[PDB]
């Protein structure tokens, strides 16, 4: 599935300098709604921009007044850019994405571990390790003795690993009594039935 | 700025001096692929992803070319206004829960990077380690700065201590985020 790209327009006419240009495609409710914006940045400062909702290039700063005017004057350029809403955004979504990103699913690897040695009747800490999963949206809960609990529980927010796999950790503040068995429960679209890990105290 | 998904189909970055460029594609925040400006070839993060879709490198090459041009133009339009450096902040963690002996991966997440030129090396007991290291591209940040990730494959053992050594111009001296299996 050949993917398409946005085309930067030509600018009109020891210290470091950084330039950056990007084509941002915003898909609200799948392809149903699409907002397209291109940003031209020179030293962390956005100076010109094309907002799908404005229909043309606009100067965000005075440093971008030249470029904006010239690109809007030349019909060829303006239409080229404008059309990218379909030729790039819609095309990639309905094509490469739908058959690659939008349809990739990775199942988590849950495992329960306890901080300090099992000290019966002595407060300790239990942690649920949900790792390696995609997409993002996921839920986690702690099952003590058949009863879910919220108090004394905390989970680090989504930890993006960078390799298209996410991660999250949930700590349980309890006390390992005798007999009772703890179990972590997590809901993730990468699976039909909530995966549940158990730990006999 | 709200939406269910956001694809950045075309991210071109160009620096001067040094004549440094980067061209990538991003989706929901992860990197789909990047064009190797030297090898003139596309490189997908997920090799499997490269099996399903495709992208002509020239698309990135032409852009970089345009970006390089405009950089020269804007540098003048603002009479050589230089870029103010930043102090990058690192963070280290394992890809999965650590279990002594069981091979894992150490991740260093460096953020607030600007300009996009940094050295990120790993240290094993204060010793420079090479093999087993994979570095990503520069990801884009809303404030137009950048962020990068580096990965190291190791064998969990209390017998060793690690630290991510970050070297950047915005730092008075190299910094290192220490991390141990303790």
């Amino acid at each position: 599935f050949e993917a398409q790209k946005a085309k930067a327009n030509k600018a009109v006419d020891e210290r470091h300098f950084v330039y950056q240009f990007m084509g941002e495609c915003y898909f609200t409710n799948g392809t149903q709604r699409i907002r397209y914006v291109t940003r031209y940045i020179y030293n962390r400062e956005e100076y010109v921009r094309y907002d799908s909702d404005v229909g043309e290039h606009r100067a965000v700063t005075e440093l971008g007044r030249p470029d904006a005017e010239y690109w809007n004057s030349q019909p060829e350029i303006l239409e080229r850019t404008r059309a990218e809403l379909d030729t790039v955004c819609r095309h990639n979504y309905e094509g490469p994405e739908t058959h690659t990103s939008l349809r990739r699913l990775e199942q988590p690897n849950v495992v329960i571990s306890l901080s300090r040695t099992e000290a019966l009747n002595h407060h300790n800490t239990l942690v649920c390790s949900v790792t390696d999963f995609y997409p993002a949206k996921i839920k986690v809960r702690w099952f003590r003795n058949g009863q879910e609990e919220t108090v004394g529980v905390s989970s680090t927010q989504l930890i993006r690993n960078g390799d298209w796999t996410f991660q999250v950790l949930v700590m349980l503040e309890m006390t390992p009594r005798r007999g009772e068995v703890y179990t972590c429960h997590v809901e993730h679209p990468s699976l039909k039935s909530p995966i549940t890990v158990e730990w006999k105290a | 700025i709200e939406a269910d998904h956001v694809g950045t189909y075309g991210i071109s970055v160009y620096q001067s001096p040094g004549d440094i460029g980067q061209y990538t594609f991003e989706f929901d925040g992860d990197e789909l692929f990047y064009v190797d400006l030297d090898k003139k070839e596309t490189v997908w993060m997920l090799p499997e992803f490269g099996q399903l879709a495709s992208f002509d490198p020239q698309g990135g090459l032409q852009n970089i070319a345009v970006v390089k041009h405009n950089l020269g133009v804007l540098t003048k339009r603002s009479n050589s206004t230089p870029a103010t450096n930043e102090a990058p902040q690192a963070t280290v963690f394992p890809k999965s829960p650590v279990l002594l002996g069981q091979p894992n991966t150490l991740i260093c997440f460096v953020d607030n990077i600007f300009p996009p030129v940094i050295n990120i090396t790993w240290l094993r007991n204060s010793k420079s380690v090479a093999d087993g290291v994979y570095e990503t591209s520069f990801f884009v940040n809303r404030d137009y700065s950048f962020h990068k990730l580096s990965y190291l494959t190791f064998i969990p053992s209390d017998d060793d201590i690690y630290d991510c050594k970050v070297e950047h111009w915005g730092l008075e001296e190299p910094v290192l985020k220490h991390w141990e299996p303790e």
Partner: T-cell receptor
Amino acid sequence: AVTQSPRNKVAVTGGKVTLSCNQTNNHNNMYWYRQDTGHGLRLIHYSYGAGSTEKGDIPDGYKASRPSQENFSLILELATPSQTSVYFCASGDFWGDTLYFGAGTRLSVLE
Amino acid sequence: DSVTQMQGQVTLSENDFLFINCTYSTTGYPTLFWYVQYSGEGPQLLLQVTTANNKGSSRGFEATYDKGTTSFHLQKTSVQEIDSAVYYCAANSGTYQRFGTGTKLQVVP
């Protein structure tokens, strides 16, 4: 505008030819096409700017060089008969959606 | 991305109807061009069309960007003897323009 030197030249097989091209109009991209019969125009090498050179559809046997911005030249080392034909250089702006050719160049690579 | 001029060579009497056929095939959204090359000189631009479905015309010629037929045929109503030359069809949905084989037009007085 754009001009090619030499306009025409003969060369012995195994030789070494160097086609030069120099355009006035500040164009970033430059191309080297080869005209024949039954193939019309075919791209050999192009360039997005100084220091740049990209492979066209038929790059085999040729080398390209973009030293300056206004100068792009095609280079044939071990020339062969199969490389005998007409060569048209072209300059144009980004994304090559607007290109201007030169007068042409007749090349004869005899056995 | 590839062009296809089925027209090997065309010859017709002055003030006739010229119709050179061209069919492309891309994976993108190419711009279509027509180049006229008069014997002796290099090829020059006649007309082009970036946006799909709509026609471009110049000095008596005109061609339509038909997506349904992936075609870009060249038309002329009163072909003068001056219009005798080689006509090239080209398309570019990337960084460089690819050309078709070519079609030679001989307009007899």
